[PDB]
Design a protein around this ligand. Structure first.
Ligand SMILES: Nc1ncnc2c1ncn2[C@@H]1O[C@H](COS(=O)(=O)NC(=O)c2csc(-c3nc4ccc(O)cc4s3)n2)[C@@H](O)[C@H]1O
Length: 533
């Protein structure tokens, strides 16, 4: 058992009851403390108090409960990051209705298939996303109601969140006497997240564990709710969803930035007195280089975190020195593990490490071809188990069991080693998966589009390392015998077929063979790609 790394016992205890109960219990409290702000849009200088947030989420839960929704139902929240985003999430959580967040970047096909899985009864959506929701509802009969999020009044004949609640609540309804539902938090699903595409069922139990990590003085943030954090992370993904839920149960003021502005990301830090910034590894070179950074009162900024993708050790400690931080704080996780399950422990900074095993979890490194558990400083595939690991892929047990073994070990597709202090380091990726500016890009979609081309015999798609995007989608192309085609042509061809995140920005390299085994070798493909550039 010396080769199994285990989290310590939690520094903030696990709390009783559903995640809805825990959220409600905590926000009801913040809601009684005058002037406590829950969310701030940094762009337009608009705040929503905890009081207001709590009241609207409660109005929403009762309305939904009266509309007929129970633990047998799901909803979708399809919306770009906004002040209103969490209202239906919290609302549904209070009553045990599963929330299925949809990526606001999704096209109609991806969206249709996401919701084909989640089977939601009601859909919450912004103005931007309504027309897509409509085109889907036609093909998806189970959707019976579409409610607009970023409108106060009704819109194109559809109820807003506000008119929807006034119409389903009994008059003289009191929010502060609402009691959230109790249910078996192990079997009641809190969220169904997309995993590129499948539905990741996350029970309430997993959220309860996250709420422990979140308020943990070592593995999250110490609970002084007089705290302001700035977050630039998409709400619809696990990184943004479970950090933010943890910030709310902590009573933090969550300051939001949707677009990174060099002039703003520093101004917002100074004016709002940001104590902690939750960032993605792409903004780090910016924050390492910019000279404007020098003149603001940031004495209140004691922490900067990153996650979701690799952070350069060197860049990380540069940004850490400039801000007089002990180091960049980090978290590593997958959608299937709910949230981060490796996290840099406060006071235990070690540059380049993504952190240590969180409480309740275990981690191990298994050899790439024998599957044997390995020891200290040995590169292998990282496997994890613990109570935030998803219940399983919604209506896909075969993909569930290939990912999660008989003993609960989830093999992550990442390559890692742990050192003597039990610090973990992520040094490579086994699986085929690209992250372009945080956005997931499945190589298989790109490959099938490439093969479609008459001049293309075979192709392999992987990530090309980019300093400001992390990875650029790029391809090894094997031309059909005696057929010709340039890189520019292959690129515009693919562009015509794909949404903006999947554009083959990394270019193309021509080869005689796409590296395979007995399945595509992502590492060998990334190798050939860089060998060029
Ligand atoms: N820190 C990291 N370093 C290097 N690689 C990282 C990484 N995090 C995710 N990855 C990669 O993303 C993959 C998973 O992709 S994924 O499905 O989209 N899911 C995620 O990326 C994911 C799900 S939850 C989560 C995080 N939560 C946090 C909470 C606090 C904090 O300080 C930092 C973090 S990161 N990230 C991993 O397998 C790995 O390849």
């Amino acid at each position: 058992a010396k080769n199994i790394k285990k989290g310590p016992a939690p520094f903030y205890p696990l709390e009783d009851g559903t995640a809805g109960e825990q959220l409600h219990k905590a926000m009801k409290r913040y809601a009684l403390v005058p002037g406590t702000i829950a969310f701030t849009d940094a762009h337009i200088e608009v705040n929503i108090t905890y009081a207001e947030y709590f009241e609207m989420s409660v109005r929403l839960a009762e309305a939904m409960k009266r509309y007929g929704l129970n633990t047998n139902h799901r909803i979708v929240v399809s919306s770009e990051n906004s002040l209103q985003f969490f209202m239906p999430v919290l609302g549904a959580l209070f009553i045990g209705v599963a929330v299925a967040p949809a990526n606001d970047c999704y096209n109609e096909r991806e969206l249709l298939n996401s919701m084909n899985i989640s089977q939601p009864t009601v859909v919450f959506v912004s103005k931007k996303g309504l027309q897509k929701i409509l085109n889907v509802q036609k093909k998806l009969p189970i959707i019976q109601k579409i409610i607009i999020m970023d409108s106060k009044t009704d819109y194109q004949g559809f109820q807003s969140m506000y008119t929807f609640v006034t119409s389903h609540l009994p008059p003289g309804f009191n929010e502060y006497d609402f009691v959230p539902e109790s249910f078996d938090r192990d079997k009641t699903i809190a969220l169904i997240m997309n995993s590129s595409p499948k539905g990741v069922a996350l029970p309430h139990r997993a959220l309860a564990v996250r709420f422990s990590h979140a308020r943990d003085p070592i593995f999250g943030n110490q609970i002084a709710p007089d705290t302001a954090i700035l977050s630039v992370v998409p709400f619809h993904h696990g990184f943004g969803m479970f950090t933010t839920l943890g910030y709310l149960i902590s009573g933090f003021r969550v300051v939001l930035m949707y677009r990174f502005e060099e002039e703003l990301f520093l101004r917002s830090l100074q004016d709002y007195k940001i104590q902690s910034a939750l960032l993605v590894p792409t903004l780090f070179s910016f924050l390492a280089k910019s000279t404007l950074i020098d003149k603001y009162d940031l004495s209140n900024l004691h922490e900067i975190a990153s996650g979701g993708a690799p952070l350069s050790k060197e860049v990380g400690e540069a940004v850490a020195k400039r801000f007089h931080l002990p180091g960049i704080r980090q978290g590593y996780g997958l959608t299937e593990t709910t949230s981060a399950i490796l996290i840099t422990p406060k006071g235990d900074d070690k540059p380049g490490a993504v952190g240590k095993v969180v409480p309740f979890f275990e981690a191990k490194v298994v050899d790439l071809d024998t599957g044997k558990t390995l020891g200290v400083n040995q590169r292998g595939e990282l496997s994890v188990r613990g109570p935030m690991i998803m219940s399983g892929y919604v209506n896909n047990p075969e993909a569930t069991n290939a990912l999660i073994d008989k003993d609960g070990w989830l093999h992550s597709g990442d390559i890692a080693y742990w050192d003597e202090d039990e610090h973990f380091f992520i040094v490579d990726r086994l699986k085929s998966l690209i992250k372009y500016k945080g956005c997931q890009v499945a190589p298989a979609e790109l490959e099938s589009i490439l093969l479609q081309h008459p001049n293309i015999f075979d192709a392999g798609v992987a990530g090309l390392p980019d300093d400001d995007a992390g990875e650029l989608p790029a391809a090894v192309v094997v031309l059909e015998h005696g057929k010709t085609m340039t890189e520019k042509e292959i690129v515009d061809y693919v562009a015509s077929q794909v949404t903006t995140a999947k554009k083959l920005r990394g270019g193309v390299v021509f080869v005689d063979e796409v590296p395979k085994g007995l399945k595509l070798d992502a590492r060998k493909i990334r190798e050939i790609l860089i060998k060029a550039k």
